[PDB]
Amino acid sequence: AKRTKKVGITGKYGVRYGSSLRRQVKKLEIQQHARYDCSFCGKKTVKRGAAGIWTCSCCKKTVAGGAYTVSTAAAATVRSTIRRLREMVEA
Amino acid sequence: PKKRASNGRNKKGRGHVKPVRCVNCSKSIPKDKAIKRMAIRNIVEAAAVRDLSEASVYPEYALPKTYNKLHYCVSCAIHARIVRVRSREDRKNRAPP
Amino acid sequence: SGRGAPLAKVVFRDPYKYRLREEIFIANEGVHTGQFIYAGKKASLNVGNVLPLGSVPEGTIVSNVEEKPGDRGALARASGNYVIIIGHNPDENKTRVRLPSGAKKVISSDARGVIGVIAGGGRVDKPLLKAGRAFHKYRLKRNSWPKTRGVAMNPVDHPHGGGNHQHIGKASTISRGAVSGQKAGLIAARRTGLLRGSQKT
Amino acid sequence: GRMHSAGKGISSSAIPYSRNAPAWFKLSSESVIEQIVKYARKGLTPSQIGVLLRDAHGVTQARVITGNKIMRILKSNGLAPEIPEDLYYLIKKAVSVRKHLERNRKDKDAKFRLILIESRIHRLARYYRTVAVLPPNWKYESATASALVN
Amino acid sequence: AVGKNKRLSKGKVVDPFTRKEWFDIKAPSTFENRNVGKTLVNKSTGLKSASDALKGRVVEVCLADLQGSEDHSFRKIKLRVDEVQGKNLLTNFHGMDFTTDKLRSMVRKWQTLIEANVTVKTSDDYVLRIFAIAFTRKQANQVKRHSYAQSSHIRAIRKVISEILTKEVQGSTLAQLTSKLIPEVINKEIENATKDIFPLQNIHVRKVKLLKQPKFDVGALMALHG
Amino acid sequence: MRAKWRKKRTRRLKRKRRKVRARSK
Amino acid sequence: SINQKLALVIKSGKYTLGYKSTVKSLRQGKSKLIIIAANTPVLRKSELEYYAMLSKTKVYYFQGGNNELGTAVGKLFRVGVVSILEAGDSDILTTL
Amino acid sequence: SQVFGVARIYASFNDTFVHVTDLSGKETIARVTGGMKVKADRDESSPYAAMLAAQDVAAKCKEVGITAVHVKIRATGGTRTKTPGPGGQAALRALARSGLRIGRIEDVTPVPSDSTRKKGGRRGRRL
RNA sequence: GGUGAAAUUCUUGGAUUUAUUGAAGACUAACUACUGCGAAAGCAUUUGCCAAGGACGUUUUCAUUAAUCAAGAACGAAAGUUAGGGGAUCGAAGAUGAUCAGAUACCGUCGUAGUCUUAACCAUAAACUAUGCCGACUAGGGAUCGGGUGGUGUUUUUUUAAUGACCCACUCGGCACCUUACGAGAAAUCAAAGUCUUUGGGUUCUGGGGGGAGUAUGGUCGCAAGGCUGAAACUUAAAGGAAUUG
Ligand SMILES: [Mg+2]
Ligand SMILES: [Mg+2]
Ligand SMILES: [Mg+2]
Ligand SMILES: [Mg+2]
Ligand SMILES: [Mg+2]
Ligand SMILES: [Mg+2]
Ligand SMILES: [Mg+2]
Ligand SMILES: [Mg+2]
Ligand SMILES: [Mg+2]
Ligand SMILES: [Mg+2]
Ligand SMILES: [Mg+2]
Ligand SMILES: [Mg+2]
Ligand SMILES: [Mg+2]
Ligand SMILES: [Mg+2]
Ligand SMILES: [Mg+2]
Ligand SMILES: [Mg+2]
Ligand SMILES: [Mg+2]
Ligand SMILES: [Mg+2]
Ligand SMILES: [Mg+2]
Ligand SMILES: [Mg+2]
Ligand SMILES: [Mg+2]
Ligand SMILES: [Mg+2]
Ligand SMILES: [Mg+2]
Ligand SMILES: [Zn+2]
Known part of the structure; x- marks a missing residue:
């Protein structure tokens, strides 16, 4: 049965700190406790160790990432622009 | 009442058309509604042709021309006399003059 | 501990003696364990490599950038920060760069930097929610927390202390030429109040 | 025509008048x-x-x-066959669209067309249950359907 | 506006053309006429050298002026100075572009405009982007008045144009590409390849731009000059 | 007045009435 | 397409899935083709290439990871490498 | 026989610019505008101010040494009008009549493939 | 620079203008039309991948499985809301220069939110063809888009085959247009808005003089803005439509 209508994991916080702060915490907590696809072994086994450290429990690889998600949008765009500049260095 | 069967525009079977801006005032008007004209102009304005011809270093110089497409809103076209208000029966005449 | 960004232990061979050296780099985002890192003038434009700034094109994103060649990293070291290479000037070899604060610096093109963004970004987007979370944060940094307001103090303890109400009294904008013991408040402030309009960086 | 569009096409076979045929066969x-x-x-x-x-x-x-x-x-x-041919084809089109949707959550047109396809599936299944070529309590579910495609 | 300047300066006359000296621009041997014209630069002094100010310059000259024929009047060639010897500057190829009047005269209503571009490397390590344009045309005996293509024609035409352009630029050096672009043989090649797809007219190589240059070769430049 | 601005005035009045009733309750 | 050729091979031919059985088939010489996923570790990939060089067996590099290769061979589990032992009524050996 | 510059007339509304550069465009000879020859902001873009400006750039070009020009005519362009102002034609005719020789007229008004956004709002400039 | 004319603003520390390079975000000119697609909102650079769709062709197959739909559901411009990113342009607010009796308006120069994107909300527009859907029939005319059939038709290839592109004839399905009015209508006008006092093909929704009023109240959805549902007391002889002459 559905125990909570909208608080989810932030139901651990009770009635404290304000609903808007609890919402932002909920959005970031879901991301940091989510399991992620491993780009080396191909399984959904990547979990956060501390802020910025993402380890696959299967193949034991560890990737540096965002504080609460395995990859930030800024890092994705930096990867894209570095690949473009690298390709221009040859062509 | 309804003035025009075309509703003052040209959009049968679309719904939405991307707009353009009036060249005179920058009013946003849909592309099918605007008053497109084609300004194809000599570069030397027909009174300096002789002067530029005698000042040219080349014989038989081709003397290019300028091309511009002008988009007008209804207010600016009527105010600038590009189109003018026609009679009720003559409103239906689609042909250029 | 005390740092928002993760670190990378990278092992190189010593070129003059048979052993192994370990360096503590700041991990760039996307660097993984078992990755080969290339440091040098001839290294390729890949995330994690340690090129000098004169050998990267314009628009390159780097981090852990030397202010001067050889001081082994000064600029854009906190999580999510980076430096953008604006331009080069080969005669009188200088590189113009954009710092995280928006400042434009002209440094030597022999200064090195790490291609990519410092990992761990987005951290300050999470609300701490709790005095205890602030406690545990500063327990590993320094004794700068909690902070008593100077206007809650007595006048023996602070320029803002005292009064039959809690109020500052004089203006809180304090000159650059003030002396220590006077410099509490907004020091050398060009303007105050809520930032309306562009800052014109 | 076109129960799920505004098309009005009349393209069809026109079978001959002769019910016994064709004297060269x-x-x-x-x-x-x-x-x-x-x-x-x-x-x-x-x-x-x-x-x-x-x-x-x-x-x-x-x-x-x-x-x-x-x-x-x-x-x-x-x-x-265990299920009729047209219903089988409708089910396999539905499973291909649904697989495409889990690949592409932002495909709103694919979501719309999935609704149309599964409506058509449920209408045929109701007819086939009524004429009892499918058992009563035969239900189309997506999770079982992907294996029902075989 | 001769008297409206409130302050001339925040802080409150020698003729420079006495200091300036002339140089002669030289086109490569691929073009027929070497003498392009003249430029100015300040005389070389201790602080500033004249060749440093000269080596960056780009001169856009009409191909009709380069080749002596008026059928080239709608194409412009950019020539970039690379070396200063004596009193004449030596230029290499830097780009090609149509003229605005020619492009706008080619673009007309009731036909289809087809465009293609390829990025491709030459034999001597020049990276180029080549832009080609074409237009649908009516047949003779055609009575309908607009002559459009059906978009799969456009895709097929763009494919054959792109493969022809890559084949022509690859395996040729930059000088050989210039010597191909002058007679416009690529236009005839595109016409012969596309004549089975749709009739087409005004087939052109509209632009060539240099994305990347190789490391500078004085040997190649004096191969071009002389 | 113009109907759009009459609608705006009505919406402002409705919001004010809600605030006053919330004061009451 | 390569996915269609693989589907036809799964329908009417002989194949094996997985690294151990693929290496066994390479040693026994029964393998006609090996297809390696994109995200296969480079050590395993170079080992399979060495085995295929000894066996004179063709190697195809499947774009996409082991999840996509498993979907392509029509299995609900991820497949790192697939060895085609007999292509029946398929042209995957003749092409590519 | 002839030594060439380029003429580079920029005829906007509110002003006209006539200035001759070398064949590379890097070295300038005689930048004179229509606002340098009148005393009114109205008359800054008049044909008469333009012909005065063209006469003086032609005098300075004849004194420097340039005998012929390649003309590049220009309107403001971008998101703006792309119609040349009232003074460009007068400047071109004055440059022709001054004694300079002409070759290779071209219009170089900057035309966008799909501009940023025009000024004025969607209701336009209300007059 | 701007304008009807100006001023605010920037300029010997060099503005504007020219040249050479570079970066960023947005947009997709011209081609572009009484043309195409989509349930509508909407959709315009290339190429690849992913699934979808109509029409046409069919001597394929099933066989009445259909039409329209209370309840219930998906999508739903722009603005707006929350949180990251981005933040070049334009630009609600605001600052300013004019104009003016005033002018916190129009005009000028700046400029925050916004404009773009990701995740989640919101459910409205003159969201218009102000024209519900399905079916049948009733006047002529040419053009056009997609498919199909025929012609010793034209052109191109290898003169000559097949293709392709055109031309002509027909056909199915579209977006439309022109002419008439048998017919309809208060008229404007309409090939449907006709086949309606000679009044019945099937079905959903909505209106009953003008205001009060999309208000109050009660539900319900929404973080909010608000949406959906929705009166009455009281007031009033006209409001309103289409055309005529001034
Ligand atoms: Mg009216
Ligand atoms: Mg609309
Ligand atoms: Mg303490
Ligand atoms: Mg405190
Ligand atoms: Mg006290
Ligand atoms: Mg004190
Ligand atoms: Mg005090
Ligand atoms: Mg007290
Ligand atoms: Mg029908
Ligand atoms: Mg239906
Ligand atoms: Mg300057
Ligand atoms: Mg375009
Ligand atoms: Mg089209
Ligand atoms: Mg204001
Ligand atoms: Mg509504
Ligand atoms: Mg309506
Ligand atoms: Mg009907
Ligand atoms: Mg047809
Ligand atoms: Mg038709
Ligand atoms: Mg249509
Ligand atoms: Mg009534
Ligand atoms: Mg009533
Ligand atoms: Mg009336
Ligand atoms: Zn793993």
Whole structure:
């Protein structure tokens, strides 16, 4: 049965700190406790160790990432622009 | 009442058309509604042709021309006399003059 | 501990003696364990490599950038920060760069930097929610927390202390030429109040 | 027409007037029946069987050549599919669209067309339950359907 | 506006053309006429050298002026100075572009405009982007008045144009590409390849731009000059 | 007045009435 | 397409899935083709290439990871490498 | 026989610019505008101010040494009008009549493939 | 620079203008039309991948499985809301220069939110063809888009085959247009808005003089803005439509 209508994991916080702060915490907590696809072994086994450290429990690889998600949008765009500049260095 | 069967525009079977801006005032008007004209102009304005011809270093110089497409809103076209208000029966005449 | 960004232990061979050296780099985002890192003038434009700034094109994103060649990293070291290479000037070899604060610096093109963004970004987007979370944060940094307001103090303890109400009294904008013991408040402030309009960086 | 569009197409077969046919065709009913059976053993739907017989052989239509229709021949020879052919094709189109949707959550048009396809599936399934070629309590579910495609 | 300047300066006359000296621009041997014209630069002094100010310059000259024929009047060639010897500057190829009047005269209503571009490397390590344009045309005896293509024609035409352009630029050096672009043989090649797809008219190589140059070769430049 | 601005005035009045009733309750 | 050729091979031919059985088939010489997923570790990939060089067996590099290769061979589990032992009524050996 | 510059007339509304550069465009000879020759902001873009400006750039070009010009005519362009102002024609005719020789007229008004956004709002400039 | 004319603003520390390079975000000119697609909102650079769709062709197959739909559901411009990113342009607010009796308006120069994107909300527009859907029939005319059929038709290839592109004839399905009015209508006008006092093909929704009023109240959805549902007391002889002459 559905125990909570909208608080989810932030139901651990009770009635404290304000609903808007609890919402932002909920959005970031879901991301940091989510399991992620491993780009080396191909399984959904990547979990956060501390802020910025993402380890696959299967193949034991560890990737540096965002504080609460395995990859930030800024890092994705930096990867894209570095690949473009690298390709221009040859062509 | 309804003035025009075309509703003052040209959009049968679309719904939405991307707009353009009036060249005179920058009013946003849909592309099918605007008053497109084609300004194809000599570069030397027909009174300096002789002067530029005698000042040219080349014989038989081709003397290019300028091309511009002008988009007008209804207010600016009527105010600038590009189109003018026609009679009720003559409103239906689609042909250029 | 005390740092928002993760670190990378990278092992190189010593070129003059048979052993192994370990360096503590700041991990760039996307660097993984078992990755080969290339440091040098001839290294390729890949995330994690340690090129000098004169050998990267314009628009390159780097981090852990030397202010001067050889001081082994000064600029854009906190999580999510980076430096953008604006331009080069080969005669009188200088590189113009954009710092995280928006400042434009002209440094030597022999200064090195790490291609990519410092990992761990987005951290300050999470609300701490709790005095205890602030406690545990500063327990590993320094004794700068909690902070008593100077206007809650007595006048023996602070320029803002005292009064039959809690109020500052004089203006809180304090000159650059003030002396220590006077410099509490907004020091050398060009303007105050809520930032309306562009800052014109 | 077009229950799920505004199309008004009239494109169809126009079968001939002559119910016995076609006086240049010399094969026998048992020969074309055994061809129908060998195609069905090779695993072809009645639509595909009719197309191959109409095209490679000269079989105008099996109802006028033989006594009865291809689905009846298949059933009598024990090769009837578990679900009817059109419902099977509708189900497999639905599973392909649903797989595409989990790949592409932001495909709103694909979400719309999935709704249309599954509505059409449920309408045929209700008809087939009413005429009892499908058992009562036969339900289309997505999770079972992906394996029902086989 | 001769008297409206409130302050001339925040802080509150020698003729420079006495200091300036002339140099002669030289086109490569691929073009017929070497003498392009003249430029100015300040005389070389201790602080500033004249060749440093000269080596960056780009001169856009009409191909009709380069080749002596008026059928080239709608194409412009950019020539970039690379070396200063004596009193004349040596230029290499830097780009090609149509003229605005020619492009706008080619673009007309009731036809289809087809465009293609390829990025491709030459034999001597020049990276180029080549832009080609074409237009649908009516047949003779055609009575309908607009002559459009059906978009799969456009895709097929763009494919054959792109493969022809890559084949022509690859395996040729930059000088050989210039010597191909002058007679416009690529236009005839595109016409012969596309004549089975749709009739087409005004087939052109509209632009060539240099994305990347190789490391500078004085040997190649004096191969071009002389 | 113009109907759009009459609608705006009505919406402002409705919001003010809600605030006053919330003061009451 | 390569996915269609693989589907036809799964329908009417002989194949094996997985690294151990693929290496066994390479040693026994029964393998006609090996297809390696994109995200296969480079050590395993170079080992399979060395085995295929000894066996004179063709190697195809499947774009997409082991999840996509498993979907392509029509299995609900991820497949790192697939060895085609007999292609029946398929042209995957003749092409590519 | 002839030594060439380029003429580079920029005729906007509110002003006209006539200035001759070398064949590379890097070295300038005689930048004179229509606002340098009148005393009114109205008359800054008049044909008469333009012909005065063209006469003086032609005098300075004849004194420097340039005998012929390649003309590049220009309107404001971008998101703006792309119609040349009232003074460009007068400047071109004055440059022709001054004694300079002309070759290779071209219009170089900057035309966008799909501009940023025009000024004025969607209701336009209300007059 | 701007304008009807100006001023605010920037300029010997060099503005504007020219040249050479570079970066960023947005947009997709011209081609572009009484043309195409989509349930509508909407959709315009290339190429690849992913699934979808109509029409046409069909001597394939099933066989009445259909039409329209209370309840219930998906999508739903722009603005707006929350949180990251981005933040070049334009630009609600605001600052300013004019104009003016005033001018916190129009005009000028700046400029925050916004404009773009990701995740989640919101459910409205003159969301218009102000024209519900499905079916049948009733006047002529040419053009056009997609498919199909025919012609010793034209052109191109290898003069000559097949293709392709055109031309002509027909056909199915579209977006439309022109002419008439048998017919309809208060008229404007309409090939449907006709086949309606000679009044019945099937079905959903909505209106009953003008205001009060999309208000109050009660539900319900929404973080909010608000949406959906929705009166009455009281007031009033006209409001309103289409045309005529001034
Ligand atoms: Mg009116
Ligand atoms: Mg609309
Ligand atoms: Mg403490
Ligand atoms: Mg405190
Ligand atoms: Mg106290
Ligand atoms: Mg004190
Ligand atoms: Mg005090
Ligand atoms: Mg007290
Ligand atoms: Mg029908
Ligand atoms: Mg229906
Ligand atoms: Mg300057
Ligand atoms: Mg375009
Ligand atoms: Mg089209
Ligand atoms: Mg204001
Ligand atoms: Mg509504
Ligand atoms: Mg309506
Ligand atoms: Mg009807
Ligand atoms: Mg047709
Ligand atoms: Mg038709
Ligand atoms: Mg249509
Ligand atoms: Mg009533
Ligand atoms: Mg009423
Ligand atoms: Mg009236
Ligand atoms: Zn793993």
